[PDB]
């Protein structure tokens, strides 16, 4: 069985979020997680070096995006305060 690495990271907003995301399902998960399609060079997450491309997102600022659409997650990420906590999962398919 595949065993990824999920960790909650805390980053701030410099000029939005330069990274692609997707709301789909997978294995051992009958919901829709917010996966990271890619990260635009220059973004706070890219420059820092925490999350990577082809990852999964569960919790955001204390909340949980388990079973939400790409719009709901993306819209929620933009409607956040200065600091934004995100729990990424080290995986890939």
From Swiss-Prot:
All copies of domain PDZ, residue ranges: 6-92
PTM-bearing positions, type Phosphoserine: 82
Top-level taxon of origin: Eukaryota
Places the protein is found: Cell junction, Adherens junction
Free-text note regarding domains: The PDZ/DHR domain interacts with the C-terminus of nectin and the Pro-rich C-terminal domain interacts with F-actin.
Quaternary assembly: Homodimer. Interacts with F-actin, nectin and NECTIN3. Essential for the association of nectin and E-cadherin. Isoform 1/s-afadin does not interact with F-actin. Interacts with ZO-1 and occludin, but probably in an indirect manner. Interacts with RIT1 and RIT2. Interacts with NRXN1 and BCR. Interacts with ADAM10; the interaction locks ADAM10 at adherens junctions following ADAM10 recruitment to adherens junctions by TSPAN33.
Function in brief: Belongs to an adhesion system, probably together with the E-cadherin-catenin system, which plays a role in the organization of homotypic, interneuronal and heterotypic cell-cell adherens junctions (AJs). Nectin- and actin-filament-binding protein that connects nectin to the actin cytoskeleton. May play a key role in the organization of epithelial structures of the embryonic ectoderm. Essential for the organization of adherens junctions.
Disease in which the protein is involved: A chromosomal aberration involving AFDN is associated with acute leukemias. Translocation t(6;11)(q27;q23) with KMT2A/MLL1. The result is a rogue activator protein.
Protein name: Afadin
Biological source species: Homo sapiens
Included stretch of the parent chain: 1003 to 1094 of 1824
């Amino acid at each position: 069985m595949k065993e990824p690495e999920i960790i909650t990271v805390t980053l701030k907003k410099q000029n939005g979020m330069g990274l692609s995301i997707v709301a789909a399902k997978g294995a051992g998960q009958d919901k829709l997680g917010i996966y990271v399609k890619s990260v635009v060079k220059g973004g706070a997450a890219d420059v820092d070096g925490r999350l990577a491309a082809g990852d999964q997102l569960l919790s955001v600022d204390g909340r949980s995006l388990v079973g939400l659409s790409q719009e709901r997650a993306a819209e929620l990420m933009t409607r956040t305060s200065s600091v934004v906590t995100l729990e990424v999962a080290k995986q890939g398919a």
